[PDB]
Symmetry: C4
């Protein structure tokens, strides 16, 4: 038909395979670009993580590595000591810190003019809580009292906390640093502004106030730079864009020809989905994703985008798609095409059995959540329950799940017995039946392919 | 026959499928009710857990997060310091605690009138233990000496412990608090009474006295409440009850008609279990469970039931059952019905092989318990042994099991060799044979279904 | 033939199945005896473990739970402080300990008359080690200098350690205690003599001296006991012995009749292994094991055996065997016999493939040991390597194995690359081929059984 | 043909199997040599590890076991204290250490004449970093200022660190010790020179300076040794070499005869790869590896090679190969040859499906790296991503992977959703389809072998 023919068969009675060469070049350039981008991102992420760890060690009183989710205050003296230690360490940073930092001094909403640190309470507008008469009268609206501290170059120790009506206490300040680590990977050093927020959280009003530290980095270009002796990335990005544009044009032209031929055939006869060649759909999709991600990456490197997650997702999805596309060349042979056809034949029944098993799985997920949420730390949220069950049907973390309920045998024996029955039934049903049926489906598809 | 017919076939020669619509509505309402109940329970459980953690940090001397099962006293001075620290922290709570608590002051059996704390010894009536002459004379009956401490608004430091005859020392007090965290999820704040029990356990008489803290919360409604501006749950519960009642009535009427038709057929002829339609049995069971759980949940929200475990189990089992019921609609087609029929055909042989493999499994469980209980921390109880073996046949926690016995190679080499043989034999037998036979059973059932 | 017939078929043309009833009674009594013995052993083991933990906390300076394999001394002052603290805590035990202990005061080889504690050095007879001239002259023979301390009712702080030639330092003492915890499980309290050994080990001469504490309990009966109000076990043991003797006699008589019938058949004809009925061999073996274990258990309870490991192994193996014997009754039917016959048919090919795969497995074990012993903590000994590989082919502890070598990427990259190749090749080969062939063997056997 | 015949068939019409006996002897001697070498290496590795642990405990201020990757300095006072503590502990080692060590006193590049310790800064040649004006001017070239400390038998506390321009601080010294632990395994004690390097790493300039200690041991023979009473290894090594040489000669002669016979056959006829007998190729390869490894091991024991990794890899690969060679004798039968032929038939399709699945796997690896590197500690490098995914398709470490992303749900929900989709899709695709197809391939190959 000279259409739908295989490529080796076009070559026998036609032109050269000049469009299959373009695709492998696209795979090469996309992979190289992704690798380079990932290396640079690794460097930046390591810098930010190390700076945040140093900030925690400098500003959190009595902080040790690994005590992040449990780190909390339990007495009023503890809270006062933590707050004052954080402020004093802010005031002594140029003399005690191993890094080099600069003060920012306002220019924003939380901080007034000439103010570098903001110590602010947040409490209810009116709170009259007494448990002796079992009475209360609360106006929920949150009032903020902010204390401003000028960086060194007074009344922050006069702070009086409204403990019974407190919502949270927060400390806000920024630090300016220069990334000198970026020099090893060529490059010109960047200027980082770390926005540090320390939260003393009392929303639960349970007598336990967790303490956490978070940072938000804003990267700029340092004015007046000099490295005494110091385009490739931009040129490679435009090379990727040009190759992707050519691939998109060729695939679109091929799809248009296919649609025109389908229309001619349907006119002749006076199954339309068999004229589509979804490999080209995949190529076009990865093509658009690559182009969008490359523009976003160029902006990020030009320092005016700072949207790393979307660009990373776009480029990663495009790379995954272009690597999936080698199956197209693997089907051009026979001994690989038999396996690929086996998978293609097996897929629909696999999805249908996934529907049934997943309905049962959702039932088990809801039951496990509602029953073992109060007791099992692995069953707190619905997504956590789903992850636990999914890892449990694959033979992972089973004994810890059983032991976390053994640690309750003293408490409700009804709950312990229900947990035993639930876990045993679910694991047996999904290991001995569902996975075995998946294996049987694949084996049957392979048998039909061979026969 | 116009009975046992499929639904699409009733529609061709009869009425509309107005009872299949009722079931999906039931699934929707049951799932929504369960989700809402689970969210509220999550909030309450988090409040209780945080309060208990704060209590432990406030009252246990030298307590750190993670030291719960190992936390213990080893010297008489340590025991005295822990007890006195607990009592003093009880006396200083209004001045040191980050939360707001109120004293309860008796009104109960452990505490006398106007007493908030109870420090009580429990020792044998007569204990004369000497190991030098290898003699003893004990009257086991336990005597209690209770010390009552009035909350602040004297002789507890004169406590003298009968160490050689001591059974345990316990501290009992209650704290009243108001749940202000419940405001974020709408609601009117609840009043919590925490019953705190601190146990210094000396039942083993081994020179090691574990220390633990447990709480029991009693939730009431706060009299005279006010939130300045602040039925849906009750109405949705009665909606669920009404839908469930209608479903139960319809299923019961259908079952009665089926039984009458079976009786007519057996009269005509002058296999009875093939006239039952167990889908309707499942629907009725989930129906009764949902109604009972909804009444219990209404009582709990009305604050006069406080039986959370039974209601949660009822609602979770009902939700699991109603989600299993979508297989009924999946069998109405063909490509799903083949898989469901494969599972149905495979089930009996699976249960029979479960019987045989489980008999072997029980033999191994008893042997492993009796031999590795003294040495392996994973083999202490029969249920623990069963969980360990079950997770071991699924490829989980194998190397830790081997290493816990490698940590004994220095001690009995006979025991180490037996553990090696036992573990290797059990794992090989249950991985390479039993699971493979389960897979073979499912594959054979699939083959018969296709052929 | 009225021999080899099934039991339901004997009943049709003969007597009643009065020997199958005896076997289920044997299973019942053996299981009950094992459960009771296990409960008592649990109690004793818990007592010993708690006493040892208390001893460690009392006598090891700066000891914390979990620091058992890493607990060590690194300076001469540290060693001196640890030794003196141990001796002083021995001298202050009656005034500081929460338990009740008695001194033993000699009557043995390590301790002289009227001596309760033995502080002894062990050093080379002649040691002249200098690393400056790279010379040494050692006479390896170990000399012991023992210091005897009288229990309270002097020159141990004058100890001078020969550090350069030291082998080890050991402390030996005994404590007498009475097990009062045994009263809860009825019983009359036992008298325990704990032999405590503290070792300061310097055999490696590496500047790191590990410190460990071990105990050896010797349980006796307390003379002149009294519990004011306080045979079943002995009678149940003799009941088990009698039932086992009857079962052994019946099985032996049946085997003798079978051998006589085989001889008659071979005489008639002028395959011998098909006249054995190995079920009866299993019954006789479990019978002998049960009788031996019961005599040993009676001796242990009579307090003059103290050989717990052998008795536990005997009774556990017997219980496992008697529970395996229910397959005999499961084969009497058809739907269970098909599965059991499938396993019987599959077994020989499974063992042969085990031989081949195990030869490859031994090759991999030797290679992994010799290469990753110096670097990987999981590959230190051959048995550890075998356990690691066996758990690795079952999908357990794979990422930790990979990460322990990632923690070396900085050191030898040749070793890291070899570890990558070795692990990937071994896991792929034993997951995708060997286990799949085991599954194929079982599936084929099932197919032949059905066909 | 009297060629390609089986061995039992040669014996019927020819000579005795005198070359199969040589191979089992080779297996025996290779295994014994490897075991002995591994035991000696275990001893040496344990000595080095214990010495390094003692060095860390002696020289790192506030160091605890397990704090190796997190151990770091955060303040200038902390850095100064750590450096001075390390130097002072170097100066007090002969009086405080439990081991026996000797000073080395120069004779090298880092240390001047008569200097044992080198305290050296490394900073940029010109560093003018200010973040207030967002300006810098750096000359990257690294300048070193070395402080030399004479071992005891002054101005190191006058050290002034250029914090803003610092790269790293390093301490270099050597210690001489004699391995007395080697005496237990016979042997004459060795002389060890430990090269100790302590690094205070500030390459990231993030305010966090990690501290690490590494050692490099150089083992010599101690001059003038004496153990008062104290060839087998050398003789056994030459025995292995001789057996290997004979095996290599026989296999080479057989291969030459096979090639000559192939040439004669191709001349007669006027498939060549079927005259090779790759078993002999494997034997020759393991033979060369064994000989090379044995020469290297003899050199190492003679103390003038010190190249342990290459020798260990050579000997381990040779042992693995010689153990793989028992399959040759297992194929000589029939019931084993069927299984081996099944594996041989299945192998090519397995490799082709490995190609396809690995292309998809590489796509997923790149996507997972680029997206979850910034957030997931398990996805930092490409090799780490590959190990994580490979262990994830085998049911290992799944819930920890899910939980490390649950710990981010608060941060980017787009990233969390992408991680959920990515993990679920990858695990489902590679568990329910790829492994099932591998099983189907093996089952089909087994079916063709039987039929
Ligand atoms: Cl329902 C669901 C929720 C969340 C995540 C997943 Cl992977 C699922 C499932 N998709 O289909 C089934 C299949 C059988 C248990 C898994 C695999 C289940
Ligand atoms: Cl016996 C038993 C006790 C406790 C829990 C369970 Cl899941 C069982 C079993 N039920 O049947 C067998 C099947 C083969 C090992 C499991 C699965 C075993
Ligand atoms: Cl060789 C060996 C040594 C130690 C322990 C065991 Cl379980 C073995 C094996 N027995 O046969 C094979 C089978 C394939 C890997 C296991 C299972 C291997
Ligand atoms: Cl691509 C790759 C990179 C690194 C390590 C390995 Cl093991 C591989 C693979 N080799 O082929 C496939 C097969 C399917 C997932 C594994 C097994 C994959």
């Amino acid at each position: 038909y000279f259409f739908m023919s295989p490529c080796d068969k076009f070559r026998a009675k036609g032109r050269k395979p000049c469009k299959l060469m373009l695709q492998v070049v696209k795979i090469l350039v996309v992979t190289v670009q992704l690798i380079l981008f990932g290396l640079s991102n690794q460097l930046a992420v390591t810098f930010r993580e190390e700076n945040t760890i140093a900030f925690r060690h400098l500003f959190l009183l009595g902080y040790s590595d690994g005590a992040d989710d449990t780190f909390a205050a339990y007495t009023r003296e503890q809270l006062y000591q933590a707050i004052f230690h954080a402020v004093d360490q802010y005031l002594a940073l140029p003399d005690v810190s191993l890094g080099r930092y600069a003060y920012v001094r306002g220019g924003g909403d939380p901080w007034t003019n000439g103010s570098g640190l903001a110590l602010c309470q947040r409490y209810y507008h009116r709170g009259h809580v007494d448990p002796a008469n079992d009475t209360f009268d609360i106006d929920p609206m949150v009032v903020t009292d902010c204390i401003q501290v000028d960086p060194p170059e007074s009344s922050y120790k006069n702070l009086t906390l409204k403990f019974h009506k407190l919502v949270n206490v927060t400390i806000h300040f920024r630090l300016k640093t220069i990334n000198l680590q970026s020099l090893i990977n060529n490059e010109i050093p960047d200027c980082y502004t770390f926005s540090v927020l320390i939260t003393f959280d009392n929303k639960a009003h349970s007598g336990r106030i967790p303490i956490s530290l978070e940072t938000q980095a804003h990267i700029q270009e340092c004015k007046h730079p000099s490295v005494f002796q110091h385009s490739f990335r931009l040129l490679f990005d435009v090379v990727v864009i040009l190759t992707c544009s050519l691939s998109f044009l060729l695939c679109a032209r091929s799809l248009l020809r296919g649609f025109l031929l389908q229309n001619e055939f349907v006119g002749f006869m006076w199954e339309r989905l068999e004229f589509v060649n979804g490999w080209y759909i995949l190529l076009v999709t990865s093509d658009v994703l690559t182009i969008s991600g490359t523009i976003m990456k160029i902006g990020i490197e030009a320092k005016n985008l700072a949207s790393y997650d979307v660009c990373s997702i776009l480029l990663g999805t495009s790379t995954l798609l272009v690597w999936v596309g080698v199956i197209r060349y693997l089907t051009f042979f026979h001994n690989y095409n038999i396996l690929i056809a086996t998978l293609r034949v097996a897929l629909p029944s696999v999805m249908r059995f996934c529907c049934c098993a997943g309905v049962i799985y959702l039932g088990y997920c809801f039951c496990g959540w509602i029953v073992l949420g109060p007791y099992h730390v692995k069953f707190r949220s619905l997504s956590m329950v789903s992850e636990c069950l999914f890892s449990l049907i694959n033979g992972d973390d089973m004994f810890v799940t059983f032991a976390a309920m053994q640690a309750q045998q003293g408490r409700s024996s009804l709950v312990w017995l229900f947990s035993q029955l639930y876990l045993y039934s679910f694991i047996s049903l999904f290991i001995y039946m569902v996975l075995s049926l998946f294996i049987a489906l694949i084996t049957g598809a392979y048998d039909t392919i061979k026969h």
